[model samples]
Target: SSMSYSWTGALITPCSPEEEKLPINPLSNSLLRYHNKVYCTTSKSASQRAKKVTFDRTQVLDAHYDSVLKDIKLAASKVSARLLTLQQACQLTPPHSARSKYGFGAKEVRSLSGRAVNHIKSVWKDLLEDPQTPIPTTIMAKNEVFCVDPAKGGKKPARLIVYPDLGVRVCEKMALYDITQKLPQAVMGASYGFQYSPAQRVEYLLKAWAEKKDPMGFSYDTRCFDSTVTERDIRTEESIYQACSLPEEARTAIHSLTERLYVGGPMFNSKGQTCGYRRCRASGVLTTSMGNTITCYVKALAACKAAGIVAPTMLVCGDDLVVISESQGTEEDERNLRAFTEAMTRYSAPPGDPPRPEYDLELITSCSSNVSVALGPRGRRRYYLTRDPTTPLARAAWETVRHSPINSWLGNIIQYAPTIWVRMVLMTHFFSILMVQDTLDQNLGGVNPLDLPAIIERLHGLDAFSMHTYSHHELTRVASALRKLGAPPLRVWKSRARAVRASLISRGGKAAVCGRYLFNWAVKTKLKLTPLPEAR
Candidate 1:
């Protein structure tokens, strides 16, 4: 397959701001149904490990990386492909995802009970027998409730994620899941900023500042990233796969899914009417994550090279991009940026917020964190990562829950330990709430924070917990969470932190000591922002 690239000379046109449309969003409505609903107590950060199998760094950087470039190199030799057989695709499907819109459900199919297989077989057979037939998917919401539109600053909406029908979801797993799971990380893992822990992220940022003789950093974002992916891009993506050394079955499955299912699907809304047709990327699909990363990278990498960015390296997850490259001076930087914009425009991925060049390392916001400075426990200028609060009230509510799966609060506390909220609010609530539950020993999210001091040190190193500051972003989050998540005011959070501080020694062991060090903010007054670290 000879890969061809073309741009229509159209610059990326950003979508208009999300209107304060009717609060009843389709994604939100789907969530309210079929699950228990509960109000929040304190604002909490949403953090949890993703549930998916992925390649390790060794294979990603070494083996998979070489393989992908090889395929890209061999693009001209690739030709037509085959599709997976009905049974082969069906066999790949997991059992019991949901009760089907048809009379038979996943339970029956998983059990291989009564015509369940027959019904599924019929669906698969239709897919194989008539490659052009459209597969109707019943839309469902991701069950876990989460915050939405955090910047709105009112009652934060806990919106639901729209997903495909259970049946087609299985087929999707068969077709695209493997490719998504195996490919991107292999190719882009080393530079994927989100893949790094906060500690690693902090270290990397510091190192970048420390090492660069002439450093240039810029952040990139796409407007309506999912919707902007067009049908042609999907075809282009298939070519990217075809350029790879994926198994024949995997390739066929991908090709078939792209042509039959992924290209254009008749999307049914809550009213069961064919409200609209989705030609671009669907918000809910197995391929969304993989698709976003690969598609964005394809365009961005090409743009970077075309724009003549010197030794450009990217940290990309979906549409969020941070390009770190050697400084080429002001005139050259502007030229490269314009060329990058033009390249992306040709690719139909216009920037929501156009690429911004920054000389100081501390100011760049990629994956929503910048190097910020403030006073610490020893009153020295402390440096750490911080970002603007998107949804504070919702964060507070999650913090109050005894065993909330989300670890965003814990993650921030561990990373921004010196920040006011980590000390006064997050640590206060985290430990005291655990203490109050009389379950300090109990695991939260499978790793009890109480048992995590040594692990935290090993994972985050000593600087993470010792660094302190009163971050504007951190304060805004805490304040908004306190107000929105129905948490008590700042004074109340302070008292809670102090209470935890007083009982700290009584808890005993390194965990308590860890608590004391991490939550020290609740005990003292916060200082003003310090100057940024010197950019090399």
Candidate 2:
């Protein structure tokens, strides 16, 4: 009905002091030299993000959209979702989640203490009792640091995060978490991107590409995706939830929450000032990811029908979508893609850069990753997931300087374990750091150093250890990212890996297994690897 946000001239202040630039450390600097390229989004950049997102979205729903909506509702109705008990929702609170103004944090919530549980119960009861009162939300700029892109021109601004208090958040879980967990998968089916792991995602894309006769693929990019969500769209999301088989109390809570919390609210800054009013999707809600995915898939599907694209298989993660479909020839494919863009635009999900038809499977990127082929132990082609390592490398460098409990580097190693960059660079570099710090025996986050062999074995199912001779695009992207970040050359990583491998082997047990299995490619004389006892 109006602009996504209406500001009151109050600044979106940071809750604490933020580092605007990455600090240089001996460890991080040795890994990456272009520390100048790294910059964090501060409160200063809030105006820019506000300017970008504060726009009126004009959505025109049509027959195709309605038809897809009906299908989604039908799929949703197949599942009977129950309301999460107050205690269950409280237990779901993340350990590091932001505290409430009422002096209760995740600890109190997790323990289901009397104070937290009583407050949460009151919040849920209020949702059932009131249907029109707007819930107040805190608006803050998310302090995420990123690598500067030469192509994009300047430091990208921080994203605005609007969240209700911890009490409401727990209540949100009570009302919506079950629907969120089940509905998207039921509705989107195989197209639900989160259901697939990295290896499985690559396999699915490759298989879809191969099955299509003259396949044409493209990834859709929605400009200010969350801001484009209208009240009508959110109500439509509510309708989908209502279709689910639920208890009367749960149904009442869903309807009331829809009118109050999910639709729109007053936004308060960190300093207790009225920042603005938010009408779009709040980025920090329980349903943010689920709602975005469902809405995007629905629009893309309807747009596909409008464009007359045949047998389109979509992989959607939030606003990111890649569709691989049967090609009607180059001329027709191009024309249809333009029509697809037009349809999406009319639905208020316009592209930042309009999609173009891609003939190659590896060329079409979704979820910031693409399917790339590599040679396995027997020289057969094997597909794996990979992306530009710039962000991961930048973040890894930042993690070295700041002691974050969650080791993003290790997360990358686990997800992209089969990729060239993860194996050679991330593994070698982080393993060396872990050994030097004498923390190899201690748990990095929740992962034990000694469990590396078993974890990798289970995640990749043994084939990750044998992947080599990466595709040209995979190698080139990794190389370009390394050069851009001013990271050491691949040869240096190979040498370092050999040294790390030797040390790990000398340490014995699972470390030896990891060294033997993971670093077999670094040596000419490979070991006859077998499944470790831990893996079994």
Candidate 3:
């Protein structure tokens, strides 16, 4: 019972047969040469993930942790959260969310079909009435793509995803969606990672660094963070939510949901056999990311207090966190970092790699990205966020094989649009593919092709178009990733961008806007760019 997971020897199955190898496509191949270097996580690796996630988590809560928890509860009391109506919850469901065991999927739910509505209502009522029953959840292996590393034994396991039925999911939204949306920002404030864009994140980190005298920074990595979460921690998370002002019915529903769904559940495999029982955080719940973020912040804040790290600034997104704080001399900072790790380990969130203090702001990474400087058009140094292109490139190659609703390449382009690798390689490659398919105007996922220039302009502001002269470290990392992933060199991407740019400009309209705004870096003679009409 103390273990995070109790197995029944049943295999975690895949809904469909997975392709482990990247499929060859002319466009993807032209962008990346070494197909063998890419690998996809599949059902075969589920056993390994299960093994890693099944351990008992040992936790020690101290006075510092208790004090932080009290402060969070006090902060939470200032705001009131409300329940979503069944219809509202249904509307929140993504179009492609997994179907219920009752034969209704997201489409039926979103359309508010009577059958789906009835089932969801009953699920909600059941949550209120029965607080002790462990809800049944389906355990499936998440499909992800990664660059193969020989040093890390070539491949990684598929991340195990635990989720309840669609009906139950809708009920979860009805009870907790508002809390998730509001509570984290209220309590965590500027430390909350989801609220910031790439540029904002860079600015926040830089500001924090500059404010500290002799600042030191390091990222905290928890080994299997979800699995490390204990039942007490889940209850503690619910307690934080309960502290918020709410109607009596809403309060009862929240308590019932926490007891019945959030704390633990029985897991079933694809074949409907008992896979195991999960007593930790589920990866696919409505509150997963929010819960992980909040819980992590609580533990980290307490740990910082215990270790005496002055004015520690934390940027947390799920399990990834980077802390920048005033240094108390190099040796003392190193000792305090070790003390912080010890405090975190006592809280049951131990690091995979021990943290070491970093003096340079650019050297500290969070969310797999770091802040780097580049020259703006007027030759002023502009700071931006960037990460290695290996994973994005691997994922892009995989997306070519399996057409998914969400295009990872497009998402990457939108999120990291200003990054060097994205502008030169990803933008050039995807635009070329869309041109060949004659679908430049078509929608990929929910994003329209024509809206990209406007979206990039609005999100990154105007400076993304003119950023150049990347830092030496940034350039070298991109170059190294391209070589490692067997991606085309920067010069090749430059030539390809020239062709795509000319074609787009010749085509005119929004495509021309995209060409002028996005590919300005690829040309020697840049166009005079103005704000897009739609971007306003």
Candidate 4:
């Protein structure tokens, strides 16, 4: 079983420093190079980013906090009483998560026919009876050898994950799954982006632009966010539940898990020895997101007012924040931004980049995305979120099975409709992958084929051009991004797409339509690009 593998008893092991520091040799070594060392660098500057934060944190609230308080309370109303069955909960566990505590593997634990359900039921039953019992967690690191990011430092230090056994994992779902789905959106409202699709985010971004709005956008990066959440913060989260009016059982269960598994847990080394314990947020957990989002907004909104930026509306996905507000004059904007920086620093969540105003909606960058202006169907400058899709594409290509790259490209294509990468590489690869798979002409998610027409209409495009057409400037940005991210060249991607397209069209039928619509840029007769309707 994956869970029963090595790193069960040791705190950490060591490895070669030269191989890791070398440029191209990153891919040369396997797990041997990593040597199980948990690399957690913390910071703001290049070298400083490598150092961990040793500072005090705070919880801030202002007079206007009553408004956001109302919003946080409203989130509890959305909690559904219905809980998933053991089998269903088991299904939701990510494929890469830790395996069962017993002998069953993740594959068996994931399947309906396996003994996973019974084991999970017993775990859940024990949890219901007494919530304070300690639950052991296994530590594992993700093996992403290919991809790395140089901007905020490189390929985030190999995350030291602390996940429970499969049985306990499902029990956690039974206790906290409802909160996971309902809390963030309710507490944060429009600020929570995970609840919205890419299109909705785009639509929201556009609405802000068309309405002649400019909000200062800056992202916050807590020094090792998960690691920084203190034991007090964990207790505060439990109290947030009490304030929210959750069920007694759910509250007690969550509280118990927090005290037992969440706040502090015994961490083991590769050889199954008691190496150390975790007292902060564990990256892999049901409550990591909910707790982090709620906590971030709670502090940030209070700081917004403290900074004298009169009631700025925020869209926060964890630490990333985009504050939308009325345009203040130049001197005031700087003053308020400085105040914001001060407040956030006092709150222990500092800004990675100082808050600054971008002249146009297209220039503002947030969420690792830049709002760019491009010609739309009517030659109007359309603002949409676009970045060098190279990193996402490369990350996806690195995956052997279905991964996020294709899905992200498709979502971006539909939402960002006018971006160069969406029109060129995304559209070309979209059909190429689908036609190549050619299973039942179904999506990876398998939405019914008959429903696609409605989906297309919802997307506002069915007969659209995904043809590989782009200006020199657009190509330059695209190429630059790929190069910076260490992705392959445009020619390499073009060749890959062409080979897949050849396989797709050979099958005819839907594959032919893919070529005609999405791959039309390859055709001799160029069609007029359709005008996309205003986002609803």
lDDT of candidate model 2 versus the reference: 0.86
Q: Model-by-model lDDT, in order?
A: 0.56, 0.86, 0.87, 0.58
TM-score of each: 0.69, 0.96, 0.95, 0.73
Best first by TM-score, ranked: 2, 3, 4, 1
Q: Candidate 3: deviation at residue 257, Å?
A: 2.0
TM-score of 3: 0.95
* Best by the lDDT measure: 3
Write one digit per residue (lDDT tens) for candidate 2, span 1-536: 45788999899888667754434465577677888886677778999989989888788978998999898888999999998888888888999899989988999899878998888888888888899999999988887767899789668888888899999999998899999889988999999999998878888888898899788899998758889899989999999898989999998988888889888999999989998898889988888999999999999999999999999999999999999999999999999999999999899889888899999988887887778888887778877788888888878777433355238888998888888999999888878888788778787668886677688888786778888788888888888898999999898888989999999899987678778888898887877777766776
**Of 2 and 4, the candidate ranking higher by lDDT:** 2
Model 1 deviation from native, Cα RMSD in Å = 11.3
- Using TM-score, give the best candidate's number: 2
RMSD of each: 11.3, 1.8, 2.1, 7.8
Clashes by residue pair, model 2: none
Model 2: worst 10 consecutive residues (lDDT sum): 397-406
Better of 1 and 2 by TM-score: 2
Over the stretch 1-536, how does candidate 1's per-residue lDDT look in tens digits? 11111122222121222222233322222112211122331111100101111111110122323344354436423323233443454555556455666676665655565565666556544555566655653322223323543364423322223345556666666555555555676556566555777657767766765566788888778645655677777776777666666556556556776776676565453346443344566666677777788778767777787778877767787887778788789889988998888777766677765776788766688675666666644677666666654333234333221334236656656565545555565666667656666766766557666645555555544454556456665566657744544446778766766777677656777555645655545557532322222211
What is the C-alpha lDDT profile of model 4 across 118-176, one tens digit per residue?
Answer: 78777777777876666776554433433444565554544455677667777788777
> Which runs in model 4 stand beyond 4 Å of their true positions?
1-88, 94-97, 106-118, 128-133, 145-156, 209-216, 396-418, 426-476, 482-508, 521-525, 528-536
lDDT tens per residue, model 3, 1-536: 35789999899999768854434555567778887877778788999988877887788899999999999999999989898999999999999989889988999999999999999989888888888888889999997778898887779999998998999899888888899889999999999999997888888999999999788898999759988888889999889988999877788888887888788989999999998888889998988998899999999999999999988989899999989999899989999999999999899988887999999988887888888888888889888888878888887776434454138879999989888988998888889889888888887768897788899889887888899888889899989999897887898889999999999899998888888898999899988787778888
Candidate 3 stretches greater than 4 Å from native: 20-23, 399-406, 448-451
